[PDB]
Amino acid sequence: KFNKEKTRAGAEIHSLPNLNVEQKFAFIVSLFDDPSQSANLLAEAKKLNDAQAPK
Amino acid sequence: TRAGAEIHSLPNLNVEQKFAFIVSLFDDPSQSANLLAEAKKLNDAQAPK
Amino acid sequence: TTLERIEKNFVITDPRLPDNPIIFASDSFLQLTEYSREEILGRNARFLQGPETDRATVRKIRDAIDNQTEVTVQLINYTKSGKKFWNLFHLQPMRDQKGDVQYFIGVQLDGTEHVRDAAEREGVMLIKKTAENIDEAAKEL
Ligand SMILES: Cc1cc2nc3c(=O)[nH]c(=O)nc-3n(C[C@H](O)[C@H](O)[C@H](O)COP(=O)(O)O)c2cc1C
Numbered sequence: 001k002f003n004k005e006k007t008r009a010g011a012e013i014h015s016l017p018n019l020n021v022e023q024k025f026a027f028i029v030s031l032f033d034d035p036s037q038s039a040n041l042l043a044e045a046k047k048l049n050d051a052q053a054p055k
Numbered sequence: 056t057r058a059g060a061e062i063h064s065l066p067n068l069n070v071e072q073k074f075a076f077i078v079s080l081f082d083d084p085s086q087s088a089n090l091l092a093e094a095k096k097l098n099d100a101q102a103p104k
Numbered sequence: 105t106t107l108e109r110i111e112k113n114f115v116i117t118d119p120r121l122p123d124n125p126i127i128f129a130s131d132s133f134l135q136l137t138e139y140s141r142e143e144i145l146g147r148n149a150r151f152l153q154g155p156e157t158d159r160a161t162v163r164k165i166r167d168a169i170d171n172q173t174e175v176t177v178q179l180i181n182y183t184k185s186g187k188k189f190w191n192l193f194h195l196q197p198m199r200d201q202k203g204d205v206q207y208f209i210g211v212q213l214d215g216t217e218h219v220r221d222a223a224e225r226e227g228v229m230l231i232k233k234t235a236e237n238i239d240e241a242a243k244e245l
Contacts, residue, residue: 026074034097047083051082052141054140070122074118087245
């Protein structure tokens with residue numbers, strides 16, 4: 001049951017302000033296709049979100 | 056072999072997933088091993104298998 | 105990283121993805137054009153074009169990409185807010201050791217008008233050296 005963790009991580013990725021819809025769909029589909037990897041995929045989304053922060 | 060070419064060789068990642076990894080590789084090249092590890096794990100999981 | 109330390113306008117695209125989208129855009133390019141990373145990553149660079157852009161020029165770029173070769177041209181581009189600028193633009197593919205195309209590099213140099221003679225020679229020298237720097241910086245990706 002990575003079920004709660006999967007939905008939790010999907011929700012967070014959805015709310016990342018610096019990602020576009022293509023990038024959000026990439027990570028959210030990744031999660032639902034490999035829930036066991038929920039944590040690692042969430043971390044990667046956050047690193048991508050920070051790299052795309054305004055300067 | 057280069058990181059991008061390796062990402063592209065993976066049959067069972069979709070276009071958006073491929074794009075996401077490649078952009079990640081370019082923004083933090085010091086994470087390339089970790090990124091390629093993950094892309095292979097997903098490709099294993101999404102196989103018709 | 106060395107790619108981030110390159111203080112020039114450039115983007116890098118991936119022709120192996122449908123419609124050849126931008127996968128990296130320099131800090132200078134984004135601020136010059138008034139776009140953000142979230143806005144233009146994943147987009148074909150043709151969004152820079154508009155009404156006063158010369159169609160035959162854009163055709164030369166199309167053809168060079170089809171043939172997988174270099175090209176250097178000048179054409180009218182627009183910022184996000186709609187301001188015009190001349191772009192001295194150079195394109196070139198990155199290839200692996202076997203010659204297969206991995207990415208395209210594009211380098212921009214802004215002007216207020218079409219340049220020729222020595223002014224153009226200098227600009228071309230600057231952008232071509234930059235492209236070689238970019239190719240060297242990204243050769244493991
Ligand atoms: C690496 C790269 C950088 C690009 N940079 C620009 C640019 O700065 N200005 C521009 O007008 N087009 C640029 N383009 C060209 C367009 O993306 C596109 O290839 C051109 O319009 C092709 O013609 P088409 O619109 O008929 O397909 C770039 C293309 C590549 C591959």
